[PDB]
Structures are given as C-alpha cells and as structure tokens.
Design a protein around this ligand. Structure first.
Ligand SMILES: [La+3]
Length: 75
C-alpha cells in the first residue's frame, strides 16, 4: 500500500518487460491491471494513460511519471 512497496512492485513489473528503469504501455497495462484495475475502467483508456502518463516525450513511464497517476490513485 505504501510507496516503498510501490517502488518494489513497480520494478517487479518494469523488470518484467524491457529495462525496469523505463515503464511501457504493455508493462504498465499489467501493473494497472493488478495494481489498479479500477483506473482501467476510468474514461482514460490505455493509450490515453500511456500518452497521458508519458509527458517526457520519450516512451518510458518511469516511476517519475508514475507519481502522476498516484494522484488519480489517491482520489
Ligand atoms: La518518460
């Protein structure tokens, strides 16, 4: 629940596919799946979440960008 576990879990998923130093659509998908499937129900589709989360115009949703979703995960 805490952030500490979020980091671990995050890496556990980021390490799944590709470098764990960079998140991916498919990667996040899984996470968003177990991590927070309710967020998937939101009006923000994957693509939207992918593009939305990714604001560093790179392609990686590093933990940094993750803190952005933490907002929606807070509400
Ligand atoms: La990025």
């Amino acid at each position: 629940k805490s952030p500490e576990e979020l980091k671990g879990i995050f890496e556990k998923y980021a390490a799944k596919e590709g470098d764990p130093n960079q998140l991916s659509k498919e990667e996040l998908k899984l996470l968003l799946q177990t991590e927070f499937p309710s967020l998937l129900k939101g009006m923000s589709t994957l693509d939207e979440l992918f593009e939305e989360l990714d604001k560093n115009g790179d392609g990686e949703v590093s933990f940094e960008e993750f803190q952005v979703l933490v907002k929606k995960i807070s509400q």
